[PDB]
Design a protein around this nucleic acid. Structure first.
Lengths: 229, 490
DNA sequence: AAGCAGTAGAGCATGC
DNA sequence: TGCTCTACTGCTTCGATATCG
DNA sequence: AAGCAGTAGAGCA
DNA sequence: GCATGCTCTACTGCTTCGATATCG
């Protein structure tokens, strides 16, 4: 019946990183998110979207306690997406250079999803995560939030960028990373997200690690949306 | 050629004996011939309805022909199968039809010889079309129509050769006088019996052979050859209606328009836009933009590499496969390259993969070219011609995903009795014959409408199985197959 | 697509 | 305050219509 | 332009 | 040096049939 999808997107400075000859990861995330919300607006289906950005300059957040919860803003609640939720995507040239964390948008989106299921029946809770994974982590409480992810039975898809280990353009059935797009911070990021995904849902979390190259190549954004035929 | 229609003259022997019942009480050979001719017209009126069909009785008393010969009387003329001509034809049945034959033309005369073939020749000469095949189908029994004069025999075998050279071929359905294969006599020179193929066997068929597209195969850069994409399984359907004015039964020449800008006045097509509303607002285009937003490629097949025949799973399916062939009409020297690529693809079990655009503005479409090789013996059996096959391939949103979440097994004992049941129902499948009941009953409905005979000839339903010839065929193992482990158990 | 059938246009030969 | 009719109804498959080679 | 079961609003109790 | 007279060949459009996409 009614779908309630949520996007959470890193809009950080490194996400708007410099171009060695290819593209910005910010513009790649923009192309992918325009493809998805473009299909789910032009298909006239009865779903609602809510989107959260992290890596901004200000914090107009419903919860900003201290040093944590910085540069996170709920753009829009669960709405049938019109062209306003597409021009908020398109007319947003600013990346807003002040980057804080990457795990905050999941718990803020979970809190507002709980606030958004107010007498409105929903069968799916799918949240898609774009993160370049360049900032440091935050490890205050982990098993309580992993327990909430487990008990609420929500879905978390993970778009990592092109760095997965000739002319790499966007996606052409060629290479994922051109020659080297990784470092120590990206290494610990990839291993900690593999650990969380495997330990929560299993080997499908190894399959739910999608690169920005191939997510434009294939249909991998639409999952657990349709019904029996 | 392409539009060269088939011709057929029926030539019937009505001279001395067949009008009589050959001193029998069963079926006169004259009635046999009229039933066979009527069944051939009834078959070709919907089987091949552009061909030419004439009918000529010889040996009768009075005569009419364009040549003005004695005792040769034509009935119809070279044209299509017409319902009014077969309703003229069906009046020569039984004793009353035999007497109608008598009062109309009268049987019995000094029947001559090859001048009847001359009348057949002038009947073929005056057509104003093109004809592929010329067949004279002679319906007779006897053996010696030149039993006294030898010059008549020499003239007969001269005029038959004069029909032999310019492309007119005859066969005679030899009427068995006692009902057997007896007369092994000396007309194997004139000719190049069984009549069931003339009696029933072609109730639904159509004759056509078209190329469907004539494209180019390019090896992704500049290397171009020609190919033409023929069709094999086209999913035929009944012909569509025609509007008609029920007073005089004439069609009514439909014309339509768009008008009325809420005042009065036409709109020639230059002042209409093409719109799509999406909730609140509109999106307006022009007709040329809404036809331009699907344009990707030149028409043809661009090659994108090679894959073996094994890893493409031939159950992925959305459209029937077509069939390529290497013409030498666009480029020259293409059958050489395709034969070389085909034998190397065969001896390395590999298949081509391509991107395909049929027409001058069509979005692109991925196809798989899988080879095949022919087969031929002394009997000239033909199940495969030597080309490729274009398996169409789905992209991404053709496949749905079923809910899948059940898994419960049982004991491996029912597989033996089910093997016994499937071996009980084991047979060779077919080569033809599972005909469509809806189209066939519609055919016979139209037959009985245009001929007002009696009734709908109820078509036998071959698509239905034979439950009487299946249940007692398998026997009393169905109770044990039902109640070994699984009765519903209440 | 397939067949055909009808006319436009260019080049040789002529005239003032 | 409790279980069958009922208005809808999304879909699905021919049947008529229009385009293109 | 026609049917087939699925999913929430009415009628007698 | 300019205008006309005459033929043949290749381009081009029409007609019929069949297949495909579309709209109810």
């Amino acid at each position: 019946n009614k779908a309630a999808v949520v996007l959470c997107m890193d809009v950080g400075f490194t996400m708007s990183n410099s171009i060695p000859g290819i593209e910005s990861p910010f513009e790649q995330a923009k192309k992918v998110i325009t493809m998805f919300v473009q299909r789910q607006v032009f298909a006239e289906n009865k779903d609602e979207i809510a989107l959260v950005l992290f890596g901004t300059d200000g914090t107009d957040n419903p919860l900003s306690g201290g040093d944590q919860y910085q540069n996170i803003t709920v753009h829009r609640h669960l709405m049938l997406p019109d062209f306003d939720l597409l021009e908020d995507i398109e007319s947003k040239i600013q990346p807003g250079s002040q980057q804080a964390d990457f795990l905050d948008a999941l718990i803020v989106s979970m809190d507002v999803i709980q606030h958004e299921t107010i007498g409105k029946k929903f069968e799916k809770r799918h949240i898609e995560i774009f993160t370049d994974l360049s900032s440091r982590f935050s490890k205050s409480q982990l098993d309580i939030i992993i327990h909430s992810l487990k008990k609420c039975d929500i879905s978390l898809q993970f778009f990592l960028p092109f760095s997965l280990g000739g002319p790499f353009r966007l996606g052409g059935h060629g290479p994922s990373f051109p020659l080297k797009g990784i470092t120590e911070q990206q290494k610990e990021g990839l291993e900690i997200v593999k650990m969380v995904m495997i330990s929560l849902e299993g080997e499908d979390g190894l399959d739910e690690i999608y690169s920005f190259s191939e997510s434009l190549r294939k249909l991998c954004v639409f999952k657990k949306i349709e019904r029996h035929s | 050629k392409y539009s060269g229609r088939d011709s057929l003259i029926f030539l019937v022997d009505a001279s001395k004996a067949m009008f009589e019942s050959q001193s029998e009480d069963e079926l006169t050979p004259f009635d046999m011939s009229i039933q066979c001719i009527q069944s051939v017209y009834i078959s070709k009126i919907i089987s091949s309805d552009r061909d030419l069909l004439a009918v000529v009785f010889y040996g009768t008393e009075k005569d009419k022909n364009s040549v003005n010969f004695k005792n040769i009387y034509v009935l119809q003329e070279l044209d299509n199968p017409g319902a009014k001509r077969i309703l003229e034809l069906d009046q020569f049945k039984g004793q009353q039809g035999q007497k109608r034959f008598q009062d109309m033309m009268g049987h019995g005369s000094d029947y001559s010889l090859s001048e009847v073939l001359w009348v057949c020749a002038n009947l073929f000469s005056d057509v104003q079309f093109k004809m592929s095949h010329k067949r004279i189908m002679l319906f007779t029994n006897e053996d010696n129509p030149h039993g006294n004069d030898s010059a008549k025999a020499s003239r007969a075998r001269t005029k038959a050769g004069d029909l032999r050279d310019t492309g007119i071929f005859l066969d005679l359905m030899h009427l068995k006088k006692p009902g057997g294969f007896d007369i092994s006599l000396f007309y194997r020179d004139i000719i190049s019996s069984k009549l069931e193929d003339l009696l029933r066997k072609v109730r639904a068929k159509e004759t056509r052979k078209r190329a469907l597209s004539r494209l180019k195969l390019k090896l992704n850069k500049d290397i171009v050859i020609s190919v033409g994409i023929y069709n094999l399984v086209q999913k035929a359907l009944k012909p569509p209606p025609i509007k008609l004015y029920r007073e005089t039964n004439e069609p009514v020449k439909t014309k339509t328009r768009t008008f009325n800008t809420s005042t009065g006045g036409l709109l020639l097509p230059s002042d209409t836009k093409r719109s799509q509303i999406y909730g609140s607002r509109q999106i307006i285009l022009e007709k040329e933009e809404t036809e331009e937003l699907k344009r990707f490629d030149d028409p043809g097949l661009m090659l994108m590499g090679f894959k073996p025949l094994v890893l493409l799973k031939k159950h992925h399916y959305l459209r029937p496969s077509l069939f390529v062939y290497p013409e030498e009409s666009l480029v020259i020297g293409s059958s050489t390259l395709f034969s070389a690529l085909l034998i190397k693809c065969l001896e390395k079990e590999v298949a081509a993969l391509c991107r395909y655009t049929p027409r001058r503005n069509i979005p692109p479409y991925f196809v798989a070219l899988v080879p095949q090789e022919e087969e031929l013996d002394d009997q000239k059996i033909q199940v495969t011609p030597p080309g490729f096959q274009l398996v169409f391939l789905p992209f991404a949103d053709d496949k749905r995903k079923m809910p899948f979440t059940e898994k419960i097994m049982a004991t491996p004992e029912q597989v033996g009795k089910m093997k016994a049941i499937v071996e009980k129902l084991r047979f060779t499948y077919r080569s033809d014959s599972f005909e469509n009941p809806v189209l066939q009953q519609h055919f016979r409905n139209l037959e009985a409408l245009a001929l007002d005979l009696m009734e709908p000839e109820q078509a036998v339903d071959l698509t239905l199985p034979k439950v009487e010839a299946m249940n007692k065929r398998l026997g009393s193992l169905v109770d044990e197959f039902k109640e070994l482990v699984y009765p519903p158990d209440y």
